[PDB]
Copies of this chain bind each other. A is one copy, B any other.
Amino acid sequence: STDSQYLQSVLHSDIPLTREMGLEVIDWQQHTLRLQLPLAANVNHKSTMFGGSLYCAAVLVGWGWLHLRLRELGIDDGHIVIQEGQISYPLPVTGTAVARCAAPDEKTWERFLTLYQRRGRARLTLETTVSNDGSDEPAVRFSGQYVLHR
């Protein structure tokens, strides 16, 4: 039983629309998370993935990174709130969408933990991408803010 399977169950329970979107968590390795959405449940006009679904993938791979990282540190007293986001759509997604979130820079992460501990509230910005399966070229570039609060 994996951290990915754990996170998938959390996402489907918390946000049941993600079950309808077919969200699947792929892997969690060296603080990189990947998840995917299938085309058919998220299609727009047969051929391409809906841009709203793509935002959902991009924002949720960041949400999941944060959830899993906190969980591995035993930080269980926080609530994540999705905040501002900026998204670009340089390429169409014509099949399964693979979303990825690598770790932020270590200093950013540690500043965020320090501020959360002191105030009980902090903001983390995560860069995420979504690609066509088998491509490293971002089809979607995303940056989003996440509040953690007690």
Which residues of A are interface residues toward B (Cβ below 8 A)?
Answer: 13-17, 20-21, 41-46, 50-53, 55-56, 59-60, 79, 81-89
Main secondary structure of the interface of A (DSSP, over half): mixed
Q: How far is the CA of A43 from the CA of B86 in the complex (A)?
A: 22
Could you show 8 A-B contacts with beta carbons less than 8 Å apart?
A15-B44, A16-B41, A17-B43, A17-B52, A46-B79, A52-B56, A52-B82, A83-B88
Shortest beta-carbon distance from A56 to chain B in Å? 3
Which of A42, A52, A56 neighbours the largest number of chain B CB atoms within 10 Å of its CB? Answer: A52
Q: Contact at A17–B84, with CB atoms within 8 Å?
A: no
Contact of A17 among B53, B59, B82 (CB under 8 A): B53
